[PDB]
């Protein structure tokens, strides 16, 4: 007995896997093109640049009642959709890769929104230079990955009650 | 005059009468219609035995094959034939397993014995008790603002089930519907509204 | 896995449908003739000669167990045939149970053939019991149905295991 | 003489991951003899496509093309959409009934199945490995493997509900011939999707 259709949770899980590969494709590009391979190194730039992170505190909770978790998931995805747009394509060589990733992320947000609607459940940083865009690109990709790795669990849990 | 090929032939397995009931669209009036079938294997490529012909009654655009004339968890090809003195038309054949095609909603009720809480219980529609079903419960405070909230993946029968958090009105409506668990089948219609007063 | 999950899913449904038909029959014999406790008819099972389909310790060679399943069923459709209708008040109820055991046997047989799992030697009906008198047919009806029922209680177990929903 | 356009039919759409576009095709019916045009029309909707969501840009078929495609940029994947074809010439116009789909519910290519000389360093064995079609590796899928000895009307032996990837898969007891033929196909797991075609047959020699 769940407030979410099992197919919705499955399509969501399929979108996480898809976005996880997009971001992986992006993070491969940035390390092959700009030898920017370890986000760890860019840790402080997180504050310097103002990279907003995304919580899922409402997710290690809920069950038959879960609009809170659905609202965090959406807003979290909604945020990374914004940050990726802020990177203004990073560069011509990364433009297509980053573009793929932002469409996917945007539609995943839309999709979680519209489902909440159906079920009745009802700014951006600057990155002012090549390097800042490249570094911001590496940090947002990795914050997206952590967010998604946590979401995967939240969802697997929801899909297997 | 020549009869036009019948259309929109559909078939449903009625557990009440234990018979595959088919109906077609007779098309532009111009005759007799004979629902014809043959036992077969999947895709209805296999030309199996001839299921005795069911001839539709007078002004009835439907027939009905009694289960004595049907193999059950096997496929069969069905089609209607319109015959006039000036020719005969014939619809496209369907290929169905009768057990694949009509559920009636489950029996939802109040648990016959906390604030904003309702205890419930339900049993499946008996003639389909053999079928493993998965149901959906939807409920809502009877307010001028119609908004249904659901509960998914419930069993076809519950000993007792406490729905809670119901404080937003003195009375709530509840309905339930089921569908064959993991094999082809359509949802049953929603059970009749059930006004219930959450423990106020 | 060797078997299609939708086949095991339909199998589990036919077992239930059939448990429903047999419970209908037993309910009818009791309501119509006050034969209401097969425990009491047990010893007549001897007389009558109602066999017992043995699921030869098969919780798992599918080719071998799915075939033990089909033969058990094939035997019960034989016994139920032997009951020659039992009596007018019962013919319909019994006929339902019968057709349903018949289909399940077929179904299982067709799947086995399409999987190349069918027994080399094909099953032939046996020497069906002597349900001579009306009472034999009714008490035969109560017993056969109780045999069938325990058979399907075990069958459901082996099948439910394979078919993991 | 010229006839009005007949209502298009047998409208089908397939989401191609390669080109990353939904390609739809229909059958226009009898020749009208007039310059008739076709337009793939759709709008975002919800299940049962009763909901009138955002309109999706028309897709006009090229002449002689009984198909039209919608680019990923126009699709909202994982939501339903209503699609229909509209034909029209000077003497009239018709429309196909509406198709209701979620593009991700409609084209897979076989998994990459390969042999291995794992060897036992025992008779009648083979070791195989397989990975799913790359463009689709984000969707969980299950696979079927079919094999048979090259014999006199040898029949296929099947293995169902297999994982979509397997680094090493031992198959032993293959004794009926020196060479077997194996093939595998996959399908989207737990969600709508069609089976892919079977991978091209491998000819392997079991041990000994």
UniProtKB/Swiss-Prot annotation, chain B:
Gene Ontology biological-process entries: amelogenesis; cell adhesion; neutrophil chemotaxis; regulation of myeloid cell differentiation
Keywords per UniProt: Cell adhesion, Disulfide bond, Glycoprotein, Immunoglobulin domain, Membrane, Receptor, Repeat, Signal, Transmembrane, Transmembrane helix
Coarse class of the protein's main subcellular location: membrane
Span of the annotated motif WSXWS motif: 187-191
Domain of life, per lineage: Eukaryota
Lineage, broadest ranks: Eukaryota, Metazoa, Chordata, Craniata, Vertebrata
Annotated source species: Mus musculus (Mouse)
MF GO annotations: cytokine receptor activity; granulocyte colony-stimulating factor binding
Protein name as catalogued: Granulocyte colony-stimulating factor receptor
Tissues/organs with expression: Found in bone marrow.
Entry domain remark: The WSXWS motif appears to be necessary for proper protein folding and thereby efficient intracellular transport and cell-surface receptor binding.
Portion held of the full protein: 122 to 332 of 837
Compartment list: Membrane
GO CC annotation, single: endocytic vesicle membrane
Known partners and oligomeric status: Homodimer. The dimeric receptor binds two CSF3 molecules. Interacts with CEACAM1; down-regulates the CSF3R-STAT3 pathway through recruitment of PTPN6 that dephosphorylates CSF3R.
Post-translational modification: N-glycosylated.
Fibronectin type-III domain boundaries: 5-106, 111-199
Swiss-Prot record, chain C:
Keywords: Cytokine, Disulfide bond, Glycoprotein, Growth factor, Pharmaceutical, Secreted, Signal
Posttranslational mods: O-glycan consists of Gal-GalNAc disaccharide which can be modified with up to two sialic acid residues (done in recombinantly expressed G-CSF from CHO cells).
Domain of life of the native organism: Eukaryota
An example Gene Ontology biological process: positive regulation of cell population proliferation
Stretches of the chain forming a coiled coil according to its record: none
Glycosylation sites: 124
One Gene Ontology cellular component: endocytic vesicle lumen
GO molecular function, one term: granulocyte colony-stimulating factor receptor binding
Record-annotated disulphide pairs: 30-36, 58-65
Compartments in which it is found: Secreted
Protein family: Belongs to the IL-6 superfamily.
Biological function: Granulocyte/macrophage colony-stimulating factors are cytokines that act in hematopoiesis by controlling the production, differentiation, and function of 2 related white cell populations of the blood, the granulocytes and the monocytes-macrophages. This CSF induces granulocytes.
Self-association state and partner proteins as the record states: Monomer.
Name of the protein in question: Granulocyte colony-stimulating factor
Organism: Homo sapiens
Taxonomic path: Eukaryota, Metazoa, Chordata, Craniata, Vertebrata
Residues of the full protein shown: 37 to 207 of 207
